Amino acid sequence: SGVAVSDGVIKVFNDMKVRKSSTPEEVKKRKKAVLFCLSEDKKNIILEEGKEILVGDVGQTVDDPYATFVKMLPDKDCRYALYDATYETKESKKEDLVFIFWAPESAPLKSKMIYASSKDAIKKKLTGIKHELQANCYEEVKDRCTLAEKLGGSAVISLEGKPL
Amino acid sequence: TTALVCDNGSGLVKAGFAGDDAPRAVFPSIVGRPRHQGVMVGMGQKDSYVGDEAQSKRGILTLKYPIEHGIITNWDDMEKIWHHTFYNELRVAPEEHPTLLTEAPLNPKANREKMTQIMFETFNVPAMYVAIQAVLSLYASGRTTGIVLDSGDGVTHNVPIYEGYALPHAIMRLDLAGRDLTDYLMKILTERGYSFVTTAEREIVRDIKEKLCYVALDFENEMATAASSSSLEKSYELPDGQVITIGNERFRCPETLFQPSFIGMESAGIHETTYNSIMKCDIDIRKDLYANNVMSGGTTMYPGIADRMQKEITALAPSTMKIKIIAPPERKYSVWIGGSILASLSTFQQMWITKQEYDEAGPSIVHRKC
Amino acid sequence: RTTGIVLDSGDGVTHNVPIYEGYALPHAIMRLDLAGRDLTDYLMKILTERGYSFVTTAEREIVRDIKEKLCYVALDFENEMATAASSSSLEKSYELPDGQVITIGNERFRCPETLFQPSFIGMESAGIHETTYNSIMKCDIDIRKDLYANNVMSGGTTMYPGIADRMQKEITALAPSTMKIKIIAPPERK
Amino acid sequence: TTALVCDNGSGLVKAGFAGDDAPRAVFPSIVGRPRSYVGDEAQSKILTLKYPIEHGIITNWDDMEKIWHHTFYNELRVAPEEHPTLLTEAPLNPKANREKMTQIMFETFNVPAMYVAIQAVLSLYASGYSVWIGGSILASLSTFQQMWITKQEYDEAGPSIVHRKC
Amino acid sequence: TTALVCDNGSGLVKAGFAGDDAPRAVFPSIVGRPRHQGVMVGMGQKDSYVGDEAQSKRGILTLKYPIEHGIITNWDDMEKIWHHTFYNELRVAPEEHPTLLTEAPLNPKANREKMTQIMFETFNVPAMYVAIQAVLSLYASGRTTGIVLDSGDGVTHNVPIYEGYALPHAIMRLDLAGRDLTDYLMKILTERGYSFVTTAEREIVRDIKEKLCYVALDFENEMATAASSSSLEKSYELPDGQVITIGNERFRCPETLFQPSFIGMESAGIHETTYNSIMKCDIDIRKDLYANNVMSGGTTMYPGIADRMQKEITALAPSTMKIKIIAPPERKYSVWIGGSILASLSTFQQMWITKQEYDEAGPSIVHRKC
């Protein structure tokens, strides 16, 4: 295991999971999808301010929240993710968050072992999360059908405001 | 300003604000403790999993329902589910908006007392109210007259309601609901070579019953068609990859709603309890109750249950009387629809039990008020 | 990663344990006594048919290096035998420490086949392609979808050229068609 | 400061420090009595080779601790009293093997701290000699540095701390 | 005149005539194909070996059980075993005496249909009948009231039976039986240095479990005694000549009957399934079912299983109720005893399904009759 989580990531998770009554001007800077990284010393899980996605921009500059999110993951390193999905089922309309464990084969072993052995140190601190998505290849995470297969299986008819 | 309506059902928790059409939060009401030691270190392993995260990780969990047939068996996981649907699902605090809870009639007073105590002590809500699921499901119908056939996952109950005055002496309660149907389907599916023993698997049988089961117009002729040919059999895609071929089980396990002798219960089916309650009602309101049988709940979503309910009731009721079975297309959440349309009413805004009213009264104000 | 069954096969033991998202399944832990030492013994036993006797322990290390740098697993046994039977297009020579050269033919892919057909050295155990499927079929029915697409291999015995492709083919032959099979073959799995 | 990771496998013993890519010490795990010699000197030399480890369980203990002393002194030229050691094992392992491992490491060598991980879990860490790669990438982790079983923790607990900790 | 009763169990085949106390034919139900080429020419090498000849020549064979947990997996070897026990063991023809077959409840209908088809087409019996193993094991007890704990080699099932009317809605079935115990013993014996991988060897572990395993009064204190000293260890004489020293495995592998989490099953132990089935039964028959827990099968032959079953049930049942565990000394063949005492009854002689009744009905008469 080893690596633990910092206070900023826990604060961001508590901010994203539990939303409250907010003003229409502030509601547009909420966090939609944020990744997690390691510092220089590889001892804390820190979010990078560079790569991120806001809730405000979704549907505007970012035509597709998921489509613009696949290319945001670096293919030469291991990364965490937290995607807020809005999928439509035959039964009803749900809005859940997804934990994506990005781990390509092109990354070095030093970045794969650290992120694989410390996954229980981050997932345990993220209380209430259900949808877990482990993705290693890039083609499997690039496809749109896999998210509906993991979320609800064949029941999900539409994903992110558009049908499958 | 807005009010929260939380239909804490036996199988699903429909939670949402007031004044809107559909509930935004819908998820199964189960908690799952980790079954295996968990060799991998880190990654955010938690002590429990509630709702959709439990449904996704149900392979390594041991799912269990905190609510039996309507009574809340375990309280720690119940308040955990409440905290979850309040914070991790709606992202709102209970201290601001009043909450509305639902329950089935003929309910132990201890359940309602513990509900009120948990809502007023742990969350400290400004006000709340404990209504009845069937009365709210009747509100959603827009009318005030007619008996309600409310059958969810743990309890099936019927209460006849006239033009505003309900009849509490004719409230029937049947412990036969969707969970019992799922258990019967699991028991009768072993005769085909498919063993479902564990709780996690049982959810697969639940989905199979949800999307492959129907109620027959009559039992005998459908069995005769089941006996002859496979014209009735249909295959299902299991999550593991295998396929199953169910035959008469498509309409045998839903027949338990009308013939409780399958799971062993001695209670009259859902088609006879309604007639017995109406026959226990007043003789002038029977003409209006016969033509108004409002159905609600997820168990009333089988294809053909409305036609069989009709046929059975006109078989029991006199011939001159006309029987109507209101089968709304949103009867799966009719209780939540009624709660949401009820919370927006101006006249109801005065009868919320408040903390200032609750202090001197203790947890016993709910019986005298509601 | 944290999810996936592990195919660990070293020099003395081959064992498989399926591990989910942190909780492993101890009731599905399979153990097979077939490993690289047994493969070396089988190669020594089948190399005497070519005129090269390796009896002593010291020599056996030469056979071990020969198996390490000249043996591969075939995509299928039958067609590769048909190619072995016809022509020497398959044979390859080796430089022995004493100076002599040897010409091995079907032994390049016959002794690694013992991993999938234990009836060569006499064991009754199902090959490494069937023990994994039997352990996954002994596992839970919801974790099979995640265990089928994650078969992590390790150990020096899993370093034969083409063992990943044969493992794949065998598992999708055993597993249902709708399920997708993936065989993670890391380049540092030794 | 640095930590030792010792993959005491059935056929090879991959032993090396933490924080480096490749294990410096690799040799077969056999002892040979004249018809002792450990590792490459046994491979070069009239002996009767035998493996102390069967399918994962350690059959004989004197030669096992002899191999440990060898790989510690005649191969790495370091003392166990300074750097913590990391041992590996296969799952579904008899508890007696791990108990004897802990007892030998804490009584004969008197290590400041140690830990008994699983070979497959470490080989998965290496994915981001795979077991040794994962052990070495695991030993450098800061979060893991707290869960080493120490001698001061071992005294009152006896050789049974390993089951409850690891 | 006489009737044949054939208890085609998962591990043993008890076959004998009617009206006698003990079954004359007892042998393991396995078939063995020759594993090796067989260089020697002649001497009567056969394609298969059934029963004791397979047990004697198990070294060069590959033993396998045609019956899983109650369902018959392979049919050719099953009818081969039937032909064997009919001709080479009893030296009688099936065309003369009627045969009586047994099965476990909650059984796939295909198994019973194939049983009837094989008995009526290949052997052409004048009449037959398919009873239930637990009901017959209760007959052997001489009484009519009490729940039956039938646990053989492949399936453990419990059915409560009142004063002639059994309760089919409370029939519990557990796939944990002696074969699973043998597998667990093989898995936990490798920790001592004894590897049993092959089927032939597994029989040695089966005999070791049969004559060296017992169930503890409680798990914790017996482990404490196992941990301290070898006062518990005992040696065994292997057929090859070696000796083994087993310790806590003498009472750890039989504990799986009460804690299924060892082999991974999620099912409640045999001490909880009985209590849950009785709690699912009627409230007036519980007083009579609590004091009558008839045990049968070879798995219930461990020393001390009766005392632990008692203690567990009075731990689960209320204190005022008295618990009795009928532990007969011939409960290994109680199913056969009940079948033989049943076949001599005059009232039962009328309900045999006959060939003349079978012709027009096809293989579906068995479900409507039995």
Ligand SMILES: Nc1ncnc2c1ncn2[C@@H]1O[C@H](COP(=O)(O)OP(=O)(O)O)[C@@H](O)[C@H]1O
């Ligand atoms: N489409 C469907 N067809 C048949 N049964 C269904 C369907 N959808 C849900 N159900 C059943 O209805 C139950 C849900 O009941 P619900 O109405 O949520 O009760 P409550 O309102 O008390 O929560 C589930 O257990 C399921 O078995």
Ligand SMILES: Nc1ncnc2c1ncn2[C@@H]1O[C@H](COP(=O)(O)OP(=O)(O)O)[C@@H](O)[C@H]1O
């Ligand atoms: N390049 C290779 N190709 C095929 N087999 C190999 C190769 N390298 C090593 N092996 C085999 O792998 C074995 C080493 O197994 P190893 O992974 O060291 O087991 P352990 O991890 O238990 O020590 C050797 O006996 C050798 O036969």
Ligand SMILES: Nc1ncnc2c1ncn2[C@@H]1O[C@H](COP(=O)(O)OP(=O)(O)O)[C@@H](O)[C@H]1O
């Ligand atoms: N003396 C004994 N002690 C413990 N277990 C026994 C004993 N004798 C037999 N068994 C177990 O009982 C099993 C036989 O079950 P059995 O009663 O023949 O089932 P069935 O009636 O379905 O054939 C064997 O597999 C064996 O493991």
Ligand SMILES: [Mg+2]
């Ligand atoms: Mg309801």
Ligand SMILES: [Mg+2]
């Ligand atoms: Mg190894």
Ligand SMILES: [Mg+2]
């Ligand atoms: Mg039996």
